[PDB]
Design a protein around this ligand. Structure first.
Ligand SMILES: CCCCCCCCCCCCCCCCCC(=O)OC[C@H](COP(=O)([O-])OCC(O)COP(=O)([O-])OC[C@@H](COC(=O)CCCCCCCCCCCCCCCCC)OC(=O)CCCCCCCCCCCCCCCCC)OC(=O)CCCCCCCCCCCCCCCCC
Ligand SMILES: [Zn+2]
Ligand SMILES: [Zn+2]
Lengths: 464, 97, 97, 464
């Protein structure tokens, strides 16, 4: 036994109290404008950089069949010139503040944000409001982007995982708004115009659905003044056309189903199996986070996969069942998705499928306390890593105000995580997994993937 | 054309780009620890404040002098690919002389 | 060392070597047919007797002037392997001068 | 069906009368010096290059266990200077001729030949006699050559087919002179000196055991005058050391046996199956040549192996049983070897061995007239291709004089080949192959090569 090299550390998983980390974590201030727009900041005391942007409770879910793809086309168009600044003027002004603009468009969330330095907060606010409110939406730029999107559609230029997940959302959420892709079909792109973009932005980009979230080096009062000057002219929302009324009017539906996308000369075999999960507001979403940490993820560039804490990672790494896999926990406003996605080939696809199904059903019966303590510690450590980057702080502020209605404090989040034990994991796994319908999606070399009855049979055990 | 002179707006833009890169490298704790370790190993000290002061206190004349001294020094030239079109090597390293 | 001058014994040795290769390449029936075809395709006629007579009639002055006129043209340098001792690309072209 | 393209050619094999070829073939003129040395020349009517050299009826068979490898060391040492020419003088004299010197040491035959033009025959005779009769055999050059030979012994630097055929000779002709290798063991190389070389040269390089053969652009009587001037100091026979008496004193013996040389990490498997063949003087050696043509050979660089007229080539090319193979027919003074050598993998060793054994045993029952006619035409055409090259004509003259005691006219060789029919092939295969012991040698990845009893049982058919 080494005296200095063997103290302080041991492989026995024990619960860790993260309470002393809460003393120095910063506070979030929220101000609601008369427009209905919330302004939320989180000042890190010695930060030199700032992430700030606009988060919108809108996306591909709130479109129709006629204009499906308008929100994704908007991030192609919006940066191509405004009514006060040209393309080159915007490029020069963004270059001089030393940052980059960025945009994401989800099924239910959209953000446009800037990662700048602390001296360029007001300039970033002005630029973001300028693209958001006074865009040109020129027909020539629309025609210049339509052909590029049509070429990349004809080439089938897509990631494999995004292809599988789009098939999974399409077959699990049949005949509901969440089954549409963000990109949209080919015909809507072939018949897009400026009027649909104007109507979408006029309908959905309103005051109660928009959060201006800034993290890093930022003062709250100055951002309040700048937001009231710039974003003060956004329309308010009718009570009859709120987000909740649209959610009630077109609800999500989960259907147990199966799809594969077969190719004649492919090499890989990507596959995802998901169960109907929890919405964002379900209190069972925290145990689903812990269970997703318990399942974990692995890719074959790591060599310590056989010494993993997770039994699924151990099985896949030891037997070589997949080149990479990951467990996912997707949450929406009124439903969710929980499952495992992986990449394999056609000779290891059935054994990988069996490993996924056997490890999912095993959590209903046998869960040991060491795994739960390990996963709680890993999830709390992962939450502390997001606090290190101001981009993740701003993203979490925007997401939490949009989908929870409030900024969940870190003490409440640690207390809600620490209340999860093995009985809770068994109960949540019994509720969501055991003898339930699932959704199966695959793409590539999928001739040896088992059909739906094989997957349906392995959601329960006949021996207990 | 860089050796022919930089014009104010380009100098300010490049200084802001360099400052943004320098400050975004040390924004997170692992990046800051890596920067401190590499600077202490290479020099014996960490001087990010002095690097920022040097970036901000740079004039266009100093940059033009720097590029002028650079182009006098012999360069390094590397090509790649299924090379089926190339000017001769002697005339390649002549345009800076 | 070749351009400065070739001795009569060295010229006789090289002429005998070249004549031996030329008359060995056409000694077999397939080699003779291949030489006939290659010569008619390239130049329109085949006569290795004229080639042999030109080899026999070469003097040291002809070879010395040929190499002197050959060194007055562009060289060509090609290197294979790992080049950890490639001295200079420009200077080796100027060694012939 | 093109009229100009589908005349004069058809794939049905028919006998071809090669008689009109012999009118233009040159004749051989043989003289005998008083010491017993023969000079034989064949004058090609329009030639410029000439090859010439000394063929000696000696080799590693006629050594003892104390001096094994003296004959191969002779061709290492004989070109390092003479009593009249130094190293550099010999080099400039050879390179002034515009030609090559080459030597080949076998088991029963040694050659020292040159390839020059027609104007340098006399200089070649002078330099050949000077090399052969007046060599220095310096001890310093012997010590320099021994280090090179020993280093390549300890690195194990050898061709794989050479290793297999040496093992096959050492196990097939065990306790016989023909069982030794030409290069010799490590101890004899390490303990060799000038006196063993001198005694070997004085004992075996006598008058009637040497033949001076030249072919191409050469005059007979002028070469006789040069040969009498140069090779006149060669001693004559002692009656107790003639070739026939040495053959009678130490004859050859064939034993059915097995050997393999297993390596731990080897990609390839090389195996040879050989039967006791015929000697040079055996009248059944001509049907063995026809049978060697019938079996044929193949390598995987040929893409038309499946269309071959040989059944063994058909099976090996169609089924992919080997990478390359070739049937051989070795003849010696009193014995010989006959069989198939091939290069394959460990997973195809048994199938390749069964293909070899089944194609050999089938020739005792099933021989078609078309395959015999085709192989006879191929044999005669291959004999005519050797006539095109001066080197092969000179080698043919020297070998035929050394092993038959005469020069066989091409008319007699054609008449002997033309007398072989399917009945003769059946009878020769029944004499040499059917229910006989064989010798099997292997090297490399040979763990799946069958043992001797597997090979021995497949020399006969119980079905008949
Ligand atoms: C009805 C009662 C069955 C019962 O109690 O099942 C408990 C027991 C436990 O099953 P489970 O854990 O719920 O599900 C199987 C696993 O998912 C593990 O399943 P798997 O994906 O590893 O494949 C196992 C597969 C294949 O199992 C095998 O190894 C082959 C089984 C051969 C049985 C068929 C022979 C028929 C008669 C010929 C003699 O078994 C089946 O096809 C299902 C049971 C076969 C009956 O099921 C059996 O294995 C049945 C035993 C056989 C007696 C019937
Ligand atoms: Zn898109
Ligand atoms: Zn050797």
């Amino acid at each position: 036994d080494a005296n200095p090299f063997l103290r302080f550390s041991n492989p026995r998983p024990s619960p860790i109290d993260h309470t002393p980390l809460l003393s120095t974590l910063p506070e979030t201030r929220i101000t609601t404008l008369p427009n209905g727009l919330r302004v939320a900041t989180e000042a890190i005391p010695f930060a030199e950089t700032t992430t700030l942007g606009i988060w919108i409770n809108s996306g591909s879910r709130f479109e129709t069949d006629a204009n499906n793809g308008v929100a994704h086309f908007l991030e192609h168009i919006l940066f191509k010139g405004t009514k006060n600044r040209s393309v080159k003027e915007l490029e020069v002004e963004v270059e001089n503040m030393g940052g980059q603009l960025n945009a994401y468009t989800g099924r239910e969330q959209t953000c446009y944000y800037a990662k700048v330095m602390g001296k360029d907060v007001g300039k970033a606010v002005n630029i973001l409001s300028d693209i958001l409110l006074n865009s040109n939406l020129d027909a020539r730029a629309i025609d210049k982007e339509r052909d590029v999107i049509l070429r990349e559609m004809e080439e089938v230029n897509k990631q494999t995982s995004e292809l599988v997940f789009d098939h999974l959302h399409a077959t699990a959420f049949q005949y509901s708004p969440l089954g549409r892709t963000i990109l949209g079909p080919v015909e809507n792109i072939k018949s897009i115009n400026r009027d649909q973009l104007v109507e979408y932005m006029k309908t959905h980009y309103r005051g109660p659905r928009m959060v201006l979230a800034a993290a890093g080096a930022v003062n709250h009062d100055e951002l309040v003044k700048l937001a009231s000057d710039a974003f003060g002219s956004v329309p308010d929302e009718d009570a009859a056309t709120s987000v909740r009324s649209l959610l009630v009017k077109e609800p999500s539906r989960f259907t147990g189903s199966y799809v594969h996308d077969r190719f004649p000369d492919a090499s890989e075999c990507c596959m995802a199996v998901a169960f109907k999960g929890a919405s964002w507001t379900d209190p069972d979403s925290i145990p689903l986070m812990v269970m997703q940490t318990m399942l974990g993820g692995w890719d074959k560039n790591s060599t310590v996969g056989k010494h993993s804490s997770s039994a699924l990672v151990q099985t896949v790494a030891t037997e070589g069942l997949a080149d990479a896999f990951m467990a996912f926990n997707t949450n929406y406003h009124d439903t969710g998705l929980f499952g495992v996605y992986g990449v394999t080939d056609r000779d290891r696809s059935e054994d990988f499928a069996y490993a996924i199904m056997s490890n999912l059903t095993r959590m209903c019966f046998e869960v040991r306390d060491a795994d739960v303590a390990r996963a709680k510690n890993q999830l709390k450590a992962s939450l502390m890593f997001f606090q290190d980057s101001t981009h993740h702080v701003a993203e979490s502020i925007g997401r939490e105000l949009l989908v929870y209605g409030r900024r969940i404090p870190k003490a409440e989040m640690f207390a809600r995580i620490d209340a999860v034990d093995a009985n809770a994991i068994r109960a949540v796994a019994d509720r969501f997994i055991y003898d339930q319908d699932m959704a199966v999606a695959s793409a590539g070399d999928v001739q040896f993937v088992p059909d739906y009855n094989w997957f349906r049979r392995r959601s329960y055990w006949l021996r207990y | 054309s860089l050796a022919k002179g930089v014009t104010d707006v380009q100098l300010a833009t490049a200084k802001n780009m360099a400052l943004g890169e320098l400050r975004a490298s040390v924004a997170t704790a692992p990046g800051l620890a890596a920067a401190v370790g590499s600077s202490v190993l290479a020099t014996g000290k960490f001087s990010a404040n002095e690097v920022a002061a040097a970036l901000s206190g740079l004039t266009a004349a100093d940059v033009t002098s720097y590029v002028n001294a650079m182009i006098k020094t012999a360069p390094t030239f590397v090509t790649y690919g299924n090379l089926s079109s190339l000017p001769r090597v002697d005339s390649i390293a002549k345009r800076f002389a």
